[PDB]
Design an enzyme around this catalytic site. Sequence first.
Site, PDB file in Angstrom:
ATOM      1  N   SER A 173     -32.708 -12.712 -22.478  1.00 59.55           N
ATOM      2  CA  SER A 173     -31.556 -11.884 -22.668  1.00 59.55           C
ATOM      3  C   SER A 173     -30.123 -12.622 -22.679  1.00 59.55           C
ATOM      4  O   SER A 173     -29.895 -13.422 -21.335  1.00 59.55           O
ATOM      5  CB  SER A 173     -31.401 -10.062 -21.989  1.00 59.55           C
ATOM      6  OG  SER A 173     -30.936 -10.205 -20.883  1.00 59.55           O
ATOM      7  N   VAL A 210     -30.898 -10.474 -27.480  1.00 65.69           N
ATOM      8  CA  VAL A 210     -32.142  -9.618 -26.754  1.00 65.69           C
ATOM      9  C   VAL A 210     -33.261 -10.999 -27.432  1.00 65.69           C
ATOM     10  O   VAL A 210     -32.566 -10.620 -28.820  1.00 65.69           O
ATOM     11  CB  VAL A 210     -32.687  -8.328 -26.271  1.00 65.69           C
ATOM     12  CG1 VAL A 210     -32.378  -7.420 -27.928  1.00 65.69           C
ATOM     13  CG2 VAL A 210     -34.069  -8.289 -25.533  1.00 65.69           C
ATOM     14  N   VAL A 211     -33.928 -11.040 -26.586  1.00 67.69           N
ATOM     15  CA  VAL A 211     -34.828 -12.378 -27.136  1.00 67.69           C
ATOM     16  C   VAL A 211     -36.420 -12.019 -26.891  1.00 67.69           C
ATOM     17  O   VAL A 211     -36.874 -12.319 -25.654  1.00 67.69           O
ATOM     18  CB  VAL A 211     -34.937 -13.618 -27.218  1.00 67.69           C
ATOM     19  CG1 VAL A 211     -35.545 -14.097 -27.674  1.00 67.69           C
ATOM     20  CG2 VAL A 211     -33.471 -14.222 -27.045  1.00 67.69           C
ATOM     21  N   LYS A 221     -34.200 -13.273 -32.213  1.00 68.01           N
ATOM     22  CA  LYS A 221     -33.339 -13.154 -31.007  1.00 68.01           C
ATOM     23  C   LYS A 221     -31.844 -12.659 -31.707  1.00 68.01           C
ATOM     24  O   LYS A 221     -31.662 -12.265 -32.905  1.00 68.01           O
ATOM     25  CB  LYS A 221     -32.525 -14.470 -31.835  1.00 68.01           C
ATOM     26  CG  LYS A 221     -31.439 -14.773 -30.613  1.00 68.01           C
ATOM     27  CD  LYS A 221     -30.369 -15.720 -30.071  1.00 68.01           C
ATOM     28  CE  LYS A 221     -29.261 -15.895 -29.520  1.00 68.01           C
ATOM     29  NZ  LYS A 221     -28.426 -17.588 -29.057  1.00 68.01           N
ATOM     30  N   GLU A 248     -38.073 -20.843 -33.485  1.00 66.24           N
ATOM     31  CA  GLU A 248     -39.330 -20.825 -32.409  1.00 66.24           C
ATOM     32  C   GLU A 248     -39.031 -20.920 -31.276  1.00 66.24           C
ATOM     33  O   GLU A 248     -38.534 -20.883 -30.668  1.00 66.24           O
ATOM     34  CB  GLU A 248     -38.708 -22.846 -32.643  1.00 66.24           C
ATOM     35  CG  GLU A 248     -40.242 -23.301 -31.937  1.00 66.24           C
ATOM     36  CD  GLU A 248     -40.061 -24.708 -32.295  1.00 66.24           C
ATOM     37  OE1 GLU A 248     -39.198 -25.260 -32.475  1.00 66.24           O
ATOM     38  OE2 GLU A 248     -41.286 -26.358 -32.418  1.00 66.24           O
ATOM     39  N   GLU A 267     -37.694 -21.417 -19.137  1.00 70.05           N
ATOM     40  CA  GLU A 267     -36.756 -22.069 -18.695  1.00 70.05           C
ATOM     41  C   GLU A 267     -36.861 -22.885 -17.696  1.00 70.05           C
ATOM     42  O   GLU A 267     -37.891 -22.596 -16.561  1.00 70.05           O
ATOM     43  CB  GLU A 267     -35.048 -21.639 -18.269  1.00 70.05           C
ATOM     44  CG  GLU A 267     -34.915 -20.491 -19.392  1.00 70.05           C
ATOM     45  CD  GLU A 267     -34.076 -18.835 -18.886  1.00 70.05           C
ATOM     46  OE1 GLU A 267     -33.506 -19.447 -17.478  1.00 70.05           O
ATOM     47  OE2 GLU A 267     -33.987 -17.517 -19.287  1.00 70.05           O
ATOM     48  N   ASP A 273     -23.183 -25.845 -23.811  1.00 70.88           N
ATOM     49  CA  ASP A 273     -23.142 -25.347 -23.297  1.00 70.88           C
ATOM     50  C   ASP A 273     -24.996 -25.284 -22.847  1.00 70.88           C
ATOM     51  O   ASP A 273     -25.946 -24.709 -21.934  1.00 70.88           O
ATOM     52  CB  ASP A 273     -23.995 -23.366 -23.558  1.00 70.88           C
ATOM     53  CG  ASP A 273     -23.709 -22.368 -22.452  1.00 70.88           C
ATOM     54  OD1 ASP A 273     -23.161 -22.599 -21.450  1.00 70.88           O
ATOM     55  OD2 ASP A 273     -24.059 -21.315 -23.095  1.00 70.88           O
ATOM     56  N   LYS A 310     -27.298 -26.929 -20.208  1.00 71.23           N
ATOM     57  CA  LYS A 310     -27.572 -26.540 -18.482  1.00 71.23           C
ATOM     58  C   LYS A 310     -28.685 -25.735 -18.574  1.00 71.23           C
ATOM     59  O   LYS A 310     -29.476 -25.757 -19.754  1.00 71.23           O
ATOM     60  CB  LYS A 310     -26.480 -25.052 -18.114  1.00 71.23           C
ATOM     61  CG  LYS A 310     -26.828 -23.644 -19.041  1.00 71.23           C
ATOM     62  CD  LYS A 310     -26.084 -22.986 -18.730  1.00 71.23           C
ATOM     63  CE  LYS A 310     -26.020 -21.501 -19.217  1.00 71.23           C
ATOM     64  NZ  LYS A 310     -25.857 -19.879 -19.089  1.00 71.23           N
ATOM     65  N   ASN A 328     -30.815 -23.887 -20.523  1.00 71.24           N
ATOM     66  CA  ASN A 328     -31.095 -23.738 -22.286  1.00 71.24           C
ATOM     67  C   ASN A 328     -31.871 -25.026 -22.370  1.00 71.24           C
ATOM     68  O   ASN A 328     -32.199 -25.629 -23.516  1.00 71.24           O
ATOM     69  CB  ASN A 328     -29.264 -23.828 -22.271  1.00 71.24           C
ATOM     70  CG  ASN A 328     -28.601 -23.014 -22.212  1.00 71.24           C
ATOM     71  OD1 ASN A 328     -27.309 -22.753 -22.257  1.00 71.24           O
ATOM     72  ND2 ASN A 328     -28.989 -21.421 -22.702  1.00 71.24           N
ATOM     73  N   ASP A 378     -30.542 -21.470 -27.510  1.00 72.95           N
ATOM     74  CA  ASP A 378     -29.100 -21.118 -27.054  1.00 72.95           C
ATOM     75  C   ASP A 378     -27.932 -22.209 -27.805  1.00 72.95           C
ATOM     76  O   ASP A 378     -27.028 -22.605 -26.962  1.00 72.95           O
ATOM     77  CB  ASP A 378     -28.553 -20.559 -25.770  1.00 72.95           C
ATOM     78  CG  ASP A 378     -27.550 -20.271 -25.601  1.00 72.95           C
ATOM     79  OD1 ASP A 378     -27.036 -20.101 -26.674  1.00 72.95           O
ATOM     80  OD2 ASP A 378     -27.204 -20.304 -24.277  1.00 72.95           O
ATOM     81  N   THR A 403     -20.918 -22.211 -18.767  1.00 70.18           N
ATOM     82  CA  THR A 403     -20.605 -21.700 -17.690  1.00 70.18           C
ATOM     83  C   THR A 403     -20.285 -22.641 -16.599  1.00 70.18           C
ATOM     84  O   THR A 403     -20.270 -23.574 -16.707  1.00 70.18           O
ATOM     85  CB  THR A 403     -22.153 -21.704 -17.405  1.00 70.18           C
ATOM     86  OG1 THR A 403     -22.809 -20.881 -18.765  1.00 70.18           O
ATOM     87  CG2 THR A 403     -22.935 -20.549 -16.091  1.00 70.18           C
TER      88      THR A 403
HETATM   89  N1  LIG Z   1     -36.456 -20.181 -28.938  1.00 71.66           N
HETATM   90  C1  LIG Z   1     -36.849 -18.846 -27.870  1.00 71.66           C
HETATM   91  N2  LIG Z   1     -38.031 -19.959 -27.153  1.00 71.66           N
HETATM   92  C2  LIG Z   1     -37.932 -18.436 -25.700  1.00 71.66           C
HETATM   93  N3  LIG Z   1     -37.286 -17.390 -25.442  1.00 71.66           N
HETATM   94  C3  LIG Z   1     -36.189 -18.415 -25.506  1.00 71.66           C
HETATM   95  C4  LIG Z   1     -35.882 -18.904 -26.601  1.00 71.66           C
HETATM   96  N4  LIG Z   1     -34.085 -18.330 -27.334  1.00 71.66           N
HETATM   97  C5  LIG Z   1     -33.961 -17.736 -26.200  1.00 71.66           C
HETATM   98  N5  LIG Z   1     -35.293 -17.440 -25.270  1.00 71.66           N
HETATM   99  C6  LIG Z   1     -34.464 -16.595 -23.766  1.00 71.66           C
HETATM  100  O1  LIG Z   1     -33.730 -15.524 -24.707  1.00 71.66           O
HETATM  101  C7  LIG Z   1     -31.914 -16.312 -23.621  1.00 71.66           C
HETATM  102  C8  LIG Z   1     -30.746 -15.490 -24.309  1.00 71.66           C
HETATM  103  O2  LIG Z   1     -31.229 -16.196 -25.543  1.00 71.66           O
HETATM  104  P1  LIG Z   1     -29.485 -17.676 -26.195  1.00 71.66           P
HETATM  105  O3  LIG Z   1     -29.923 -17.568 -27.226  1.00 71.66           O
HETATM  106  O4  LIG Z   1     -29.042 -17.550 -25.133  1.00 71.66           O
HETATM  107  O5  LIG Z   1     -28.539 -15.895 -26.060  1.00 71.66           O
HETATM  108  P2  LIG Z   1     -27.069 -15.403 -26.024  1.00 71.66           P
HETATM  109  O6  LIG Z   1     -27.126 -14.280 -25.386  1.00 71.66           O
HETATM  110  O7  LIG Z   1     -26.986 -15.672 -27.611  1.00 71.66           O
HETATM  111  N6  LIG Z   1     -26.106 -16.800 -25.544  1.00 71.66           N
HETATM  112  P3  LIG Z   1     -25.994 -16.495 -23.624  1.00 71.66           P
HETATM  113  O8  LIG Z   1     -24.696 -15.520 -23.149  1.00 71.66           O
HETATM  114  O9  LIG Z   1     -25.495 -17.615 -23.131  1.00 71.66           O
HETATM  115  O10 LIG Z   1     -27.341 -16.199 -23.399  1.00 71.66           O
HETATM  116  C9  LIG Z   1     -32.419 -17.804 -22.970  1.00 71.66           C
HETATM  117  O11 LIG Z   1     -31.680 -18.081 -21.571  1.00 71.66           O
HETATM  118  C10 LIG Z   1     -33.546 -17.482 -22.738  1.00 71.66           C
HETATM  119  O12 LIG Z   1     -34.375 -17.183 -21.748  1.00 71.66           O
END
Ligand SMILES: Nc1ncnc2c1ncn2[C@@H]1O[C@H](COP(=O)(O)OP(=O)(O)NP(=O)(O)O)[C@@H](O)[C@H]1O
Length: 280
Positions: A20, A25-26, A41, A93, A99, A138, A140, A143, A160, A179
């Site tokens: 998340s 939330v993913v 996502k 995907e 991570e 972003d 890190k 990501n 991300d 960050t």
């Molecule tokens: N394609 C993916 N496959 C598997 N896990 C993912 C994937 N995309 C995101 N995640 C997980 O979901 C979390 C949140 O996704 P993210 O795209 O970073 O959301 P955000 O709220 O838009 N940006 P941030 O606040 O910078 O995390 C990530 O840190 C990963 O743990």
Amino acid sequence: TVFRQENVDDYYDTGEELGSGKFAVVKKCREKSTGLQYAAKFIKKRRTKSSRRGVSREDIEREVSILKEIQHPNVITLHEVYENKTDVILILELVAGGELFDFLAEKESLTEEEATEFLKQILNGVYYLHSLQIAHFDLKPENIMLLDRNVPKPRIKIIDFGLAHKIDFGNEFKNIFGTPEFVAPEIVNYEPLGLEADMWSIGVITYILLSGASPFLGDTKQETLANVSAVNYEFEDEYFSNTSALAKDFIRRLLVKDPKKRMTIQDSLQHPWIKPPQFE
Ligand SMILES: Nc1ncnc2c1ncn2[C@@H]1O[C@H](COP(=O)(O)OP(=O)(O)NP(=O)(O)O)[C@@H](O)[C@H]1O
């Protein structure tokens, strides 16, 4: 742009929460018609113009448009987009090996080989993006995700794209701040930003890969930010005494205050070591 307004649950079944963010939330999901798995996502939409909760439609559309452009082994791809009154749902995907951040938490420090194995992939992904004039903004260890964490040399994909922008004039001058540990001095100082900011973040990621320590990290966000702007870092002998001077040289040429003097993604790939939100 409008997205598919059918119920996502009519086409996918969701499972494990993957993670998340501040925005989303993913959740793992499986497409009914193919049995293939994806990462869905869910980004919460703004409910009024002046609101501060949720993400603006402009920001959502920008992340979707960038994702639609990408097709490369070291970056995630966009499968489909759905929306409803409350959320935009990106079917991404799936990267199932967790991570790089969690993988590092297990191993502490990597060898220069293991670090360069990850780093070469990261650089290939960023070379692709920068070739397309996409700044990620972003980068890190959180990501970078691994396809499979139980192989000796894990393959990675950059995720991300929530702060990513097209840089059509060589620099962008908007509200962009990632960050604090990983942002370049130009971000800290609210200056025009370009692809160079990612190259700084890569220097920070490299320092961490080799040592398990963060080069600018202070005891508060403001201290970290002040350290970044002043280029307040050093290679501690306790962590780097057995690291090659050529690895230090690579880092030194990225952690440069003036973005014009910093190595570009092309320079990083030719470098001898390689060549074969902000408030409390
Ligand atoms: N394609 C993916 N496959 C598997 N896990 C993912 C994937 N995309 C995101 N995640 C997980 O979901 C979390 C949140 O996704 P993210 O795209 O970073 O959301 P955000 O709220 O838009 N940006 P941030 O606040 O910078 O995390 C990530 O840190 C990963 O743990």
